[PDB]
Amino acid sequence: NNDKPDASDDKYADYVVRLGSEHPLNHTQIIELSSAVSRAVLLSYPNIIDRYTAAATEYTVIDALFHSPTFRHIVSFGLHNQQENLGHIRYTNEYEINNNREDEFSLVSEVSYDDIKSSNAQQVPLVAFYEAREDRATGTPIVNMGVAPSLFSGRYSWWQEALIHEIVHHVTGSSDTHEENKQGPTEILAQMVAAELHWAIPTFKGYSDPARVEAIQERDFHSLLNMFQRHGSELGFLFTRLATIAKGKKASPDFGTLTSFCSEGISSFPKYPDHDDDFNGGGAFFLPSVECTFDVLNRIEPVDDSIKFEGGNLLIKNDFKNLNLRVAQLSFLNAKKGSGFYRKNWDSWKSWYQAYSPYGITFNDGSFSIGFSSRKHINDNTKDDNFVKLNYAGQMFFDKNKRPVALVITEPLNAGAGWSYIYKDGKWHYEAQDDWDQRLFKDSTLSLDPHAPQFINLEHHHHH
Ligand code: NI
Ligand SMILES: [Zn+2]
């Protein structure tokens, strides 16, 4: 069974989960996607109204990525089925004059606070249209939405579901339905993710139930008011930022004029999603002893132009920790800074295996090897690599696509006899019997992680 149902058919939700499950996202892919989302949200700061909505957007998407199997099926579907990539989507908080109040207001900059304060959800002068749209100039996917509500307002988890909804429209291409008592495939998909993440949301007859529409007007009206409450001392600076973004313009990328978030503290601010004991990653606006920060680029700072995911972005500092590549980064950056790479005559890294100024070795198929030392390449910021806890001259192999393959270690005896670890799913795996090349890479030269980061040793590889 595989008829592609129409984008508006409820059975299209089943079509997305059934095809997205065919290609499960490995650990390397979840780590790539989480780092791509963090970057997309950061690059969206000029269009987000405040640090609160910016943090709510990022942690909502990362929480779903980590703890919602259906969200992973949805995101996987898009990659394999010519829809949008989760990291490609940018976010806007574009407000506009309510159509029923446009006889008095001709600019967003005219509406005062008391015009919103002394109003109701149906006649509020400012409205934001939740929409999965495209920037007509560049063709980039955008998600438009209103500001995030107060954490314990009782509305926040529905705002969360509402954001996942608009993303579902991009990564699955599904549509919504007008029909009575029908939720539609996008709303079905979003509600599954919300159910898995324990997000409490209200239920209605269908997507176009008038009761549903009135409740959304209420949620978005209260979120705008909760947001104003958040900025009681900088209302002038907040309204100017709102008006700038409202006219499709880029406002401060670092929220410069807004400072009142520090006084409010972490306590009432969105929390980073829960993660494994072996996870390196944290919040954006507050840093351990907690103390708020004004540097925003530093967490998504790319390490080197040569270390990137294929067809993706350059690996950020956390990417190396989460993928067990800190020893690999140190030894690669070492040869690439020292004596460079020297081309020896062996067909591949496998053929080589079978028969100060740190150097590197390039093979005939493009693959390469790097030097490993217990003294210089076993450190405190290299210690956490899982091959270290598991169980010294080594030569770590990288395939023709510059991806990590294996790490072969030896001690000063039995010159020979040593230890071997293999790279699979963002981790190193101890393979005791040293014949693993015939029993693992049987008739192949490539790494066991086809999603692992690329360590482009020589600049010309960027062309092939
Ligand atoms: Ni794209
Ligand atoms: Zn929709």
Numbering used by the authors: 1 to 289, 296 to 361, 386 to 421, 430 to 453, 456 to 504
Paper text:
Apoptosis‐inducing protein of 56 kDa (AIP56) is a major virulence factor of Photobacterium damselae subsp. piscicida (Phdp), a Gram-negative bacterium that infects warm water marine fish with high economic importance for aquaculture. AIP56 is a short-trip single-chain AB toxin18,19 secreted by the type II secretion system of Phdp20. It has zinc-metalloprotease activity towards NF-kB p65, and targets fish phagocytes leading to their elimination by post-apoptotic secondary necrosis. In this work, the determination of the three-dimensional structure of AIP56 shows that, instead of a two-domain organization suggested by previous studies, AIP56 has three-domains: a non-LEE encoded effector C (NleC)-like catalytic domain associated with a small middle domain that contains the linker-peptide, followed by the receptor-binding domain.
The final crystallographic model of AIP56 does not include residues 290-295 (ND1), 362-385 (ND2), 422-429 (ND3) and 454–455 (ND4), which are poorly defined in the electron density maps. The three-dimensional structure of AIP56 shows a three-domain organization: (i) a N-terminal NleC-like catalytic domain (N1-F255) with a conserved zinc-binding motif (H165ExxH); (ii) a middle domain (G256-E307), with a disulfide bond (C262 and C298) flanking the 35 amino acid long linker peptide (S263 to E297), packed against the catalytic domain; and (iii) a C-terminal domain (P308-N497) previously shown to be involved in receptor binding. The active-site zinc ion of AIP56 is coordinated by H165 and H169 from helix α6 and by D176 located at the loop between helices α6 and α7. In two of the AIP56 monomers of the asymmetric unit, Y207 from the loop between helices α7 and α8 is the fourth zinc ligand, similar to what is observed in NleC24. The middle domain of AIP56 is composed of one α-helix (α10), two 310 helices (η5 and η6) and two short antiparallel β-strands (β4-β5). Two cysteine residues, one in helix α10 and the other in strand β5, form a disulfide bond previously shown to be important for AIP56 toxicity. These two cysteines flank the partially structured linker peptide that comprises helix η5 and strand β4 plus a connecting 15 residue-long unstructured loop (P270-A285) that contains an aspartate-rich patch at its tip (D274HDDD278). Although this domain shows some flexibility with respect to the catalytic and middle domains, it establishes a series of contacts with helix α2 of the catalytic domain that prevent large structural movements. At the C-terminal end of the catalytic domain of AIP56, a helical hairpin formed by two amphipathic helices (α8: D209 to H231 and α9: E234 to K247) contains residues potentially available for protonation (E214, E218, H222, H231 and E234).
